[PDB]
Amino acid sequence: TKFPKFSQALAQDPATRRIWYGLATAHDLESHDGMTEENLYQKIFASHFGHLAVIFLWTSGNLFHVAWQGNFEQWVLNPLKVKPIAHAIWDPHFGQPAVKAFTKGGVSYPVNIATSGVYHWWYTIGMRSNTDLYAGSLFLLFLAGVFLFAGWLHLQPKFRPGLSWFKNNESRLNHHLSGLFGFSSLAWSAHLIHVAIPEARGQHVCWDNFTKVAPHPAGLQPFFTGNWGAYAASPDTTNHIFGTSEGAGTAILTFLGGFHPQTQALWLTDIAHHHLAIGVVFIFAGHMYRTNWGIGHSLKEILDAHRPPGGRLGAGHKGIFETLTNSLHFQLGLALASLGVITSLVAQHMYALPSYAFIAKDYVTQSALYTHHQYIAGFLMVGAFAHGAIFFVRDYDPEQNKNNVLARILDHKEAIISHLSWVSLFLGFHTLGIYVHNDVVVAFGTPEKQILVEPVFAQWIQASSGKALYGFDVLLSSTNSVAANASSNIWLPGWLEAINSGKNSLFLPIGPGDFLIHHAIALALHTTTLILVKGALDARGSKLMPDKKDFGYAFPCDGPGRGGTCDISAWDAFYLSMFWMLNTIG
Amino acid sequence: ASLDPKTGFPIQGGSAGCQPMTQAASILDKQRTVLAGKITVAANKVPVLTAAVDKMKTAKKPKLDRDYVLRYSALYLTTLVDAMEQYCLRDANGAKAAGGAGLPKFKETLKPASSSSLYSYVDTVKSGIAAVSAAAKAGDFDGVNKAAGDIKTAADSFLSTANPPIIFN
Amino acid sequence: MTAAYLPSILVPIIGLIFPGLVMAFAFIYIEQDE
């Protein structure tokens, strides 16, 4: 009668529904009884520190279980032949055939073989022994403790941040771009240049010697003279055996492109130069906003002034600043849409451009990593549209958003939804019809009759990046081109070797089957968007239920009247689009 | 009384009381047991290389794995030399190598790892690394085996003359 | 494996005692009124 202490409506329910609903509404802090905005942002802040710590405990656990029970030191000696161990098995239900069957990995105990790729990642970034995997596990346990104490500390009365702090958009953006994105990318270049690059070249560098071991023989004198190209001189040879001194160069920043010939991964000097470039860029981008010294941009001023004079967007973005800041669901939706696109980029760019040594020969790891991150991508993208629907129901004020981009999106909600319905139907009818045409004709013994459409547009894109398979002779594929000539002295020789060689997943050959499946994925992405967009736009009302906003985000129905209102809530369009997300990632 | 064969940690407790408040050991002695333990781990992994090279030679068609031999050299043999050089540094200059001169830096202005009584064994291990690599390029299985044995003898000799204090702490 | 005793000691504790205890306490907390 007191378990949902945040809900008196559930705590007085005499049924078993109280337990379920108290468990399912626990993290929806906005709906809790007597919830102010101060307390809402401060509990979200402290529970974000708890998520930070859980992530660090999870990573410390992976490092500890590999340091303790893995075969990391055996694997680093021979990374193409040894199978990485995740952790050991102690299961009292096993038979002795099961115990013998799982005793692979070169050890004397049953084990799970890791599909996470953490061995290839820890190998590439410097870790060599079990002692440093364990040291990383210890450091993450310390960091988890630091962020658990920070979560408790920022719940204390003197250390409780105000709402003015939580909505300082300019200081948070300045610090997250220049410190969290930029300086930590710059610090990651430092880790590669100081640790990962020397230890890929046989020279051990740890805390014991890294202030007395120079990453470059010249050493911070070319940097402080403008002689920056001296850091690219003498790169790693094509004879380099990763982890050893033979074939090693002295460069710490290159733009060679392509892949290390042995590990079949991106050059670590390319990765160090990438994070240095992207670091400086993000650090510069983190000086954009005005905080305390009179230079910079006000986000309010930028949003208010971006109304096209033709009037095609109405009032434009007037009032979007307030809506975003006041609405945690609008922020979550932007964050999740943004994050979902990135973990899709992570999945697509890590199989085609692997960064870790001797991965892309670990076919199980490549398959598991791609599948894992695409499923995470589909969940994040569906959740972004879910929290856009929750934004419209709970945080969207039409009077504060008069004739904005948001109001005008709702004004044409039916044009958007009906054209998504059209494109979904268009693609579905034809893609399925061509597939069924092909099935029927092949079944009837006539494979030639199949409608096989070449993916020429994508092939032209591959050729434009230098694939010579299709003979397009466009841009990089053409030797005498402005694009080809420009990159010839820098990244093109390596890239052309990588793209044209068929030993890698870079711009894999595409044919009629690829075309048909891409159109199937287009139908799936458009149909999941249709369901999610229909849910978000009709969240606040529809002809069937005009006052849908008054009922919330997740309600069962409006009853059997008006023909029947099952699955009419915006939550129910989340529910229906979750199947379409699973189908598309499938 | 000795260091563990695999983990390299102090093995047994066996007024120089081991208990923290009463410990008589210096931070230099504790750094020396850390270095000696790391030397022990690296030296005791030399049998693993010897076994691998024997497996390579007895195969139906035998080829030396230059990648395995060079990666083992990079992972353990270079580590063994650096740990021995540091022990020689602490033995010769004294407390200065323990942080008495500050953070590790270039131009540290301290006595070199050479001129130490124990340095000759470090020279033997350096010759062993060179032989391990030269044999791997040559394809000589016997060369790798004898060179690893030379390293194993040198590291054991180093530890015996060093007589490192084992600080259980 | 070093500390090979720990999987035998912890996996039954974490897998049987931990849930049993936290389920028992969770049951007491959800059912209780004051």
Partner: peptide, 30 residues
Amino acid sequence: MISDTQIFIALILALVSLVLAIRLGRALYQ
């Protein structure tokens, strides 16, 4: 390889993390 003492240090630091987790969970719960 990892010593039993090294595992015990990891278990000490994870117990400290457990106590800080209890303290954060009680603070968030109020």
